[PDB]
Structure formats: structure tokens, C-alpha cells
């Protein structure tokens, strides 16, 4: 059949505004048919590290209830996004479990944040590492001293959120990168989203 029911899977990749890295954006896509091959075919995708399956087998296999996690990171932090690795962002902002059969895309957005951008916040201080797929949203004055922390901020009383120095005259490591992570569960019971078929 024609089966022309393309879903917003092809729209989130072209969204002008994303969310913060600690308040990473989550999208659930299902009940649609879209081609996954057109993504890596384009030459505008700088980084494509896809662990769950080979890039050419996305269309061959059918999945369920696909989940997309989107955020923005710095230029020299792309290696932090990997299952079972170290990193300040990988520990206090977003962590991948080792048993993660997912797929990762990342691309530059330097021209979209030129002057630069000073509305980005990221966690820097936390008691322990984050749990997998944890939407930890909260605000508190981080304390690192024996004396109790109360009232106004000061010594051993810090704000765990800081901005980004995304100046328009910076090279690699200071250019914003849009990062999206695709995950899915295989055939829990029904099947809604599969690869396209040609006739």
C-alpha cells in the first residue's frame, strides 16, 4: 500500500529551539512510518555513533514506541555521550546505562547561536551520579562544607547551574552541538512503527 503517514520524527531534527542539557527534552514517537535511511545519507550530520544496530539496518528492522532525547552540549564533549563512560555531564547531567541498544546523532549549530548565547544552564554539582534516563529537575544551594548551609550563598554554598561561553569567535570545543539520542523497545506486544516498504 501507499502507507504515507510520515510522523514528526523528521521535524524534531529541524526544531529552532531545544531545551537545556539537564532538562533534556523527551519525545515519544509511535504509529507512523518514516524512513531512517535519509538521516545518515545527508552530509550535514557531523557525528553519527549508532551502537544498537548498523545504520543500514534501521529500515530493515521494525521497532516499537521510539523515544528521542534532545539537548545541546559543548563542542568537545561529544565523547561523553556513550554507554558506560566518564564525564561531568555524563555524571551529573545525563548518563547512559551500559545495557543500552540505542543510536546517537550530533551536529554543529554554530550559526544558530552567534552574537553569544547566554541562556544555557547545566548541572555542575550533585551528591552522586545520575540514574539512567533520569529527569532530575530541582534547584538547591549545593553545600560542600561541614558547617550547615542556609540563607544566602557563600563559602561552601554554590549554585549548581552555570552558563556557556558560546562566543561567536570561538573554535572547536566552544561551538554548540545539537545532540539527539534514539532508543526503543523491540516488540513488547504490539507493533506500530516499522520500516518503509517499496513496490
Amino acid at each position, epitope marked *: 500500500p501507499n502507507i504515507t503517514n510520515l510522523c514528526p520524527f523528521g521535524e524534531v531534527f529541524n526544531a529552532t529551539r531545544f531545551a537545556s542539557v539537564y532538562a533534556w527534552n523527551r519525545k515519544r514517537i509511535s504509529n507512523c512510518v518514516a524512513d531512517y535511511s535519509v538521516l545518515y545519507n545527508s552530509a550535514s550530520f557531523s557525528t553519527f555513533k549508532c551502537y544498537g544496530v548498523s545504520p543500514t539496518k534501521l529500515n530493515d528492522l521494525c521497532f516499537t514506541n521510539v523515544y528521542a532525547d534532545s539537548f545541546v552540549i559543548r563542542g568537545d564533549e561529544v565523547r561523553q555521550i556513550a554507554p558506560g563512560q566518564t564525564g561531568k555531564i555524563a555524571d551529573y547531567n545525563y548518563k547512559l546505562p551500559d545495557d543500552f541498544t540505542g543510536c546517537v546523532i550530533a551536529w554543529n549549530s554554530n550559526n544558530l547561536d552567534s552574537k553569544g548565547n547566554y541562556n544555557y544552564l547545566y548541572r555542575l554539582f550533585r551528591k552522586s551520579n545520575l540514574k539512567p534516563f533520569e529527569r532530575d529537575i530541582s534547584t538547591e544551594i549545593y553545600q*560542600a*562544607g*561541614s*558547617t*550547615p548551609c542556609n540563607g544566602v550563598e*557563600g*563559602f*561552601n554554598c*554554590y549554585f549548581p547551574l552555570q552558563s556557556y561561553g558560546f562566543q561567536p569567535t570561538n573554535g572547536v570545543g566552544y561551538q554548540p552541538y545539537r545532540v539527539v539520542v534514539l532508543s526503543f523497545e523491540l516488540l513488547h506486544a504490539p507493533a506500530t512503527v516499522c520500516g518503509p516498504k517499496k513496490s
Partner: antibody, heavy 120, light 108 residues
């Protein structure tokens, strides 16, 4: 596995500048702050101040002006005190301590101290 | 404001009698203290933590007190290695300031 080796006694001159070193080794230096106190030959203990290895923050007491300066270095993994205006009564012993945030608050570990004596 | 006197500067116990020292503080600022032993010549050794807790590295047979704006500590007895100075702690505001100390004398 916590240890602290300091310098020996020093003789200073009034109206001069001297240095004291607190060396920390055998454990990570980044997390816990370092505190400085003094003992003036068995008198009451005074909290000279404290410093943060990571944020490079420095905090003093209400009345400390005269030698208000701290520094730390990670290459040598130590801290340096600079004493100025050794007028008439600063002859005492300096103690360098480290606290613990996960457990054992309030200066668990101490040092041998450095005795500085003022003379002409 | 900031004052610590613990109602005494030195106390004397001859033989057998239990030793106890208070750590009366200023007006209500918080509840967090400590007690350190000061042997005559070397670095201070911590005696009690928050006035009621235990140390792994000390043969702890100690009695503490409750909470509030007043503090008290009780030590086991007068052994042969108890003659030292007693220091109390108060860590609420950044300008840390301790008391005048307490001296234990074995009244021969």
C-alpha cells in the same frame, strides 16, 4: 592513609614577610577544604581561616587583617601562608587541618604545626 | 554575639570520680559542636563529635548529652593518660571561634 608533613620552626623579624608551607600527600586534594588555626603557647585556639582547593575561595575570621592571604597549588599539592607585620606577639604555632564532608566533620585530621618566633 | 566560656576554665578530679564538662554556648545559633583532647606538646586529638556520637579509631566509652543551646560531655573515668587540655567547637557561622578551653588536673 592521610598524612601531613609541615616545615620546622622559624625565626622572624618584625615588619617583614615570611612563608609557611602545609604539604598534603597520599590522598586527593580537590574536594575537601583546608583550614588554618593558631595556638599561642597553650592559650585559646583561634580559627585563622580556610581555603577551598577547587573554587580557590578564601575565608577569614572577623579580625584577621594584616596577613590576610592564602594560596594553594596542585602541582606540589600543598598550601602556602604568608605572614606580614610580625609586630610583637605573633610568636605561636600554626596548625593546618583538613575536614571531611561525607563523614567526620570539624577538622578530623591535624598536623604537627610550625612554631614561628619573633625576635630582633 | 560570639562568646564561649563553658562556666569553667579548669576542673580537678582526684581518683575514681567521673569527669564531665559542659560546653555552654551563646544564644541560639544552631546545634553543632565537637570536643578535642590536647596533650601537652602534640597535635589535638578529637574526643567527641556533635556531643553524642562515636569514633571508630578511639576506644569510646563516653557519655554525651541531648540537643539545644547547651551541651555537655562525660568521660569514662580518670585514667593515667587523661591529664590534658579540653577544647570545644562551634561551627555555624564562617568566623569560627572556640572557647578558652578546659584543663583536667589529677588532684594528688
Amino acid at each position: 592513609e592521610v598524612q601531613l608533613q609541615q616545615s620546622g620552626p622559624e625565626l622572624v623579624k618584625p615588619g617583614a614577610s615570611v612563608k609557611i608551607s602545609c604539604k598534603t600527600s597520599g590522598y586527593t586534594f580537590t574536594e575537601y577544604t583546608i583550614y588554618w588555626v593558631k595556638q599561642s603557647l597553650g592559650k585559646s585556639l583561634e580559627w585563622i581561616g580556610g581555603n577551598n582547593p577547587n573554587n580557590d575561595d578564601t575565608t577569614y575570621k572577623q579580625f584577621f587583617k594584616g596577613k590576610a592571604t592564602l594560596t594553594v597549588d596542585k602541582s606540589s599539592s600543598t598550601a602556602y601562608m604568608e605572614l606580614r607585620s610580625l609586630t610583637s606577639e605573633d610568636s605561636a604555632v600554626y596548625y593546618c587541618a583538613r575536614d571531611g564532608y561525607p563523614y567526620y566533620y570539624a577538622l578530623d585530621f591535624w598536623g604537627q604545626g610550625t612554631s614561628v618566633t619573633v625576635s630582633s | 554575639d560570639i562568646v564561649m566560656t563553658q562556666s569553667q576554665k579548669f576542673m580537678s578530679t582526684s581518683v575514681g570520680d567521673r569527669v564531665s564538662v559542659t560546653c555552654k554556648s551563646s544564644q541560639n545559633v544552631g546545634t553543632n559542636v565537637a570536643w578535642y583532647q590536647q596533650k601537652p606538646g602534640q597535635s589535638p586529638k578529637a574526643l567527641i563529635y556533635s556531643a553524642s556520637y562515636r569514633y571508630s579509631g578511639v576506644p569510646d566509652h563516653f557519655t554525651g548529652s541531648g540537643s539545644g543551646t547547651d551541651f555537655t560531655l562525660t568521660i569514662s573515668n580518670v585514667q593515667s593518660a587523661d591529664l590534658a587540655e579540653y577544647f570545644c567547637q562551634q561551627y555555624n557561622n564562617y568566623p569560627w571561634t572556640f572557647g578558652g578551653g578546659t584543663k583536667l588536673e589529677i588532684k594528688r
